[PDB]
Amino acid sequence: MGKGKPRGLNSARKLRVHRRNNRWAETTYKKRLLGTAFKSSPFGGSSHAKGIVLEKIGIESKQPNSAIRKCVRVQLIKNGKKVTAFVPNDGCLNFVD
Amino acid sequence: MRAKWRKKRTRRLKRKRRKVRARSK
Amino acid sequence: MPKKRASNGRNKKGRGHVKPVRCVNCSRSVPKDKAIKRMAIRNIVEAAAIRDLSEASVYAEYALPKTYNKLHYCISCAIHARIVRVRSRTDRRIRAPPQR
Amino acid sequence: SLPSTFDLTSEDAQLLLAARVHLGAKNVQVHQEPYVYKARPDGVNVINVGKTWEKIVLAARIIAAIPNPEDVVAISSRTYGQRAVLKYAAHTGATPIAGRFTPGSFTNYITRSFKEPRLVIVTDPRSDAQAIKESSYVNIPVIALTDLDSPSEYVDVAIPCNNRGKHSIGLIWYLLAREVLRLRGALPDRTQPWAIMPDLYFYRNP
Amino acid sequence: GWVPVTKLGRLVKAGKISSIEEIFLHSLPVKEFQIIDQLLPNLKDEVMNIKPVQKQTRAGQRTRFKAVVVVGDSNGHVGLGIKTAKEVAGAIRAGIIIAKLSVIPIRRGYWGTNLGQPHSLATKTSGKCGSVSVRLIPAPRGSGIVASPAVKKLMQLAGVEDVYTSSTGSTRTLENTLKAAFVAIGNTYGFLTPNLWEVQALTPSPMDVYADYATAS
Amino acid sequence: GRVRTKTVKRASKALIEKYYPKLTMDFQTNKRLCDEIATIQSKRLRNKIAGYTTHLMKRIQKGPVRGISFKLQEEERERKDQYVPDVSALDLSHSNDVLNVDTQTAELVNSLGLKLPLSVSSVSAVRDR
Amino acid sequence: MENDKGQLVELYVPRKCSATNRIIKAKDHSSVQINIAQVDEEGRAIPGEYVTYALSGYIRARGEADDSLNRLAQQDGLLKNVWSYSR
Amino acid sequence: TRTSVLADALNAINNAEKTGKRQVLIRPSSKVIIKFLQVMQKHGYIGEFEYIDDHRSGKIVVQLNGRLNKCGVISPRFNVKIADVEKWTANLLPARQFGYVILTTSAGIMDHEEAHRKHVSGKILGFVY
Amino acid sequence: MVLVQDLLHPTAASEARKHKLKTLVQSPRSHFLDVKCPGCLNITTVFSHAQTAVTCESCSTVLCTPTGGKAKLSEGTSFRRK
RNA sequence: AGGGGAUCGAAGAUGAUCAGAUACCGUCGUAGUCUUAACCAUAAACUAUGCCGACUAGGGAUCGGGUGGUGUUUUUCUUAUGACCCACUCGGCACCUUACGAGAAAUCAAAGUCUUUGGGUUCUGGGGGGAGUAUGGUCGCAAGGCUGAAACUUAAAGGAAUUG
Ligand SMILES: [Mg+2]
Ligand SMILES: [Mg+2]
Ligand SMILES: [Mg+2]
Ligand SMILES: [Mg+2]
Ligand SMILES: [Mg+2]
Ligand SMILES: [Mg+2]
Ligand SMILES: [Mg+2]
Ligand SMILES: [Mg+2]
Ligand SMILES: [Mg+2]
Ligand SMILES: [Mg+2]
Ligand SMILES: [Zn+2]
Ligand SMILES: [Zn+2]
């Protein structure tokens, strides 16, 4: 077998164009090249986001386990988007208010 | 469901979609 | 599902897509290759005659011919009764004509 | 190197040729496998005789090369050799196996019929085969009496021969025993047809 | 509690095979176990992993235990036994016993320039078992074994001081990664060099020499 | 449904192995011979052993058998393998003429050998199979 | 192989197959030692003298062990008329 | 098409040596082949080899020694910048210790040790170990 | 044909057997058969694979009907080799 | 868009069955089927194996070419065609055994000559779904094709085999 890819000493371009245009099926590279982080992903492609507790929710979880999870719908400040944040530890949405 | 019909399903769904967007030129 | 067989449909090898034959029982179109083409060389008169016919007959020796139904069967149709007979993985390699 | 003595006596050739050792193998002809001097028309191959008997000596030379004689396990399954192997057993004291081999006899150190050869002899690598394929697991040579149809996989010192059977098997064993005795034993001379007898071996009336 | 079957068993009891090379020299089929303990005293004897492994039944299941045992030293011989027995201890026992039959020497080389005693591989070897290639890939001095924990412990018992690996394919299946790193080890005496170009005499084996002392009376 | 068990057949195989002599055809003798030698706890089992031993003896009269060939049965070949009914003549001599060898065989004889006896056949290769 | 000044390190310096020159390994359970007894004048097979021939497991399992052992013997003077140069 | 003859030749060698053939035939047979082989001869991976002249193209008979392991060819003849030899030979051959990288160059077709003494690099062809 | 063949010197049987192309040297196995027609006493160097309805030097006798391989020599004709 | 329509026969009617069943079966039976002039341009268009290139193993066969056999028979006397036998050969289509080679294995003499990684080239794939969807092209009479997303979603989806 020749093994698919070209092997010429002058190929290069048909490597370098191929690897541009396969990379695009690498989900790491796609998010970086298309700014999903910025254009979506509630937080602006950012570690964190201050956001005002709009309401303390109880979210009934998926299967195997069974528990209402004690969350908070938020309104992210900068974007004005609304998200749902978990509140870790015993009660502590009590501390959230 | 059977994949050929799941294909046929989304063929009608398109042909309904074509009438909807054509109703506003 | 891997290959059960190497042949599969069998005759068809080096031969695009051949013509088909309607089966006998089900009238199920099957390729004339996948077809299970048994030969039914049956007598025109059933064994439990035959005396009776030859007693009442004119002439001696007689034609006493045999009808030549070259059957076909849609594999499924064949399995349901006929020569097919579901063989073991190792036994499925054998092409030898059975009995005899 | 060699003595230039063993060139096959004119009688012993006539003995070999009497048993049709070289009017055998037939149409079917393996490609290893140069023990043909010409081929007779329609369903025949003609075996080169000189090549056989040089090896029948070579085999023996190897059989002799094992110091402990109660060790060379000859085997036979296909019936026409059974008796001949037991004759070879009698003259040259070397425990052998007639008929059924029992797998795990060179391997499997528990069996009642556990041997441990330091040489194996076989008549039909078509049939005894198992024992050959077994012997590979434990580092042993395999002297075999191959026709030009049989496979010689895991075989060293393949004596060319006719394995239609009947006469040729027993004859070729006897020529082995002969040259195994002549190469260290009682007999000091190549000459004298002596006794013994070829017909001591061979297949019998059941 | 000894009593050997097999010429070679008796032969080692007599003390005419010294230890151990001669066995390997003449690739002698060491089917008995005692032999390798007699000759090699320093066999340790480390259980890698023990999966439960179940056959399914008319009702319930059959928990066997595939205990994986690297046997070795730091001399240059290593073993690899896998054994599935229902009792676990017995499995490790039978695993150790099997590992001392499969025992196999390793061409330990340099690195580059001889200078002091060799404790890497000679060459880049590979194994291939299931879908694991172990490749390894001789180090320089003191760089260490660089390996999956499994491959490492095999390479501690070898006395390969330093080697790089490229354990490649599904190395998490340990039976295979070892079986791989065993074969890559086996490959060594098995790969030629120009330091073998020089032809040897082909010695007679102990079996051929000490015939009378072997076998029963 | 009288098929004798393994222990019955196992012992009786090992009994006739070690004691082909001390086993006279008939039962009651072989019965008393069994209780002498082998140490059976039961009565029925012992009687059933004796029952198979006899059936082994009665087969022994009509030739040998497989798995039952020990010392005396070995020797009861063996003579015949040693001193065979054959042979008169050689045999495999040049009794009738001087070997009907083929053209190819005659040519082979001439290459290796110098002067041997021959009777050149026509070598009719023949039609059909 | 040679440390400092000779001092041959690495034991098990292997049987290399006579046919191939390819190495016979420690666990080549398939390898072999054909030993062939030396001939003398008028009978006599000279007790305790062999022309040894190792075979690799490779050639042996293929079937090429047969003709390689001939050619081995033929070159080393245990045969005539057997192995030909051309075929 | 038949492109790199050298490779297409060395492939047959590598197949031959794998099975333990004592020789090989190589159809096309170039300068490069012969200077490549010549190199294998000077180190000793290869016996005699006998360049047939088809009144025509080429053809070679190599005698293998049971010494070749791999008769490598690297394919797009990469230009090598003297220091980069070390990275090729490191990545192709087993060990700093022994092996050769057959490279064409200004100097002709050396191996990578000869090319270091000379202080002259170039393109690569193949290797041997 | 297994392991050791010594491939420079084949047995001539093999050379004759193998394809006229697939040997050590590509040598063709055709000849220039010197045919004599019944008419004139003169000999035409007829290549055995002519591809043509081969006439004589002048007279239209027709010497060899070109078939696929070697040509069938028209009627009861006589020939020398090469 | 023409011609024809025998039978089957997407649609339909309709007769049974079943808790029911516009589903099999049952009976009929437009559209077609068939064809001609246009389009469409996809199929499990599947050898689910890109093309070229070389080289590795035997077995026997198998066929389309070609050689040699004082071979056999045809028999119109020698025949000469034909038709075999047998051996080997270029071209085609597939099996058996061991695999020492591959392979996750099933298996494969190619799916080998690959961690001992490089003969040449084209193409495609990067967890599953969402989706062959949304959009935009572009192509089509249309059906539809080609081209082709993410947001969102999820821990498996698979493959092969083992025992149940
Ligand atoms: Mg639930
Ligand atoms: Mg499935
Ligand atoms: Mg299925
Ligand atoms: Mg699928
Ligand atoms: Mg085709
Ligand atoms: Mg098709
Ligand atoms: Mg309907
Ligand atoms: Mg498609
Ligand atoms: Mg496809
Ligand atoms: Mg995806
Ligand atoms: Zn049907
Ligand atoms: Zn003229």
Residue numbers in the entry:
A (entry chain X): 1 to 97
B (entry chain nn): 1 to 25
C (entry chain a): 1 to 100
D (entry chain A): 2 to 207
E (entry chain C): 39 to 255
F (entry chain R), H (entry chain W): 2 to 130
G (entry chain V): 1 to 87
I (entry chain b): 1 to 82
Would you copy out the relevant sentences from the publication that reported this structure?
Type IV IRESs form a homogenous class of viral RNAs, which completely dispense with the requirement for any IFs and thus are able to directly recruit and assemble a translating 80S ribosome by themselves. The approximately 190 nucleotide sequence folds into a compact, well-defined three-dimensional structure making use of three internal pseudoknots (PKI-III). PKI is an independent domain of the type IV IRESs that mimics a tRNA anticodon stem-loop interacting with a codon.
To gain insight into this process, we assembled a pre-translocation complex with CrPV-IRES and 80S, which was subsequently incubated with eEF2 complexed with the non-hydrolysable GTP analog 5'-guanylyl-methylene-bis-phosphonate (GDPCP). Several rounds of classification in Relion were needed to identify a class of particles consisting of the entire complex that produced a map with an overall resolution of 3.6 Å. Thus, the binding of eEF2 in the GTP form induces an extra rotation of the small subunit as in canonical tRNA translocation. The ASL-like element of PKI is pushed into a position in-between the A and P sites of the small subunit, reminiscent of an ap/P state. Domains III and V of eEF2 solidly anchor the factor to the ribosome through interactions with ribosomal proteins uS12 and uL11 in the 40S and 60S subunits, respectively. These interactions help position eEF2 such that two loops at the tip of domain IV contact PKI. In our structure, H694 interacts with PKI while the diphthamide moiety (DPH) on H699 is closely packed against the sugar of nucleotide 6189 in the CrPV-IRES. The diphthamide appears to sterically prevent the rRNA decoding bases A1753 and A1754 from interacting with BP1 and BP2 of PKI, whose conformations were otherwise not altered upon binding of eEF2.
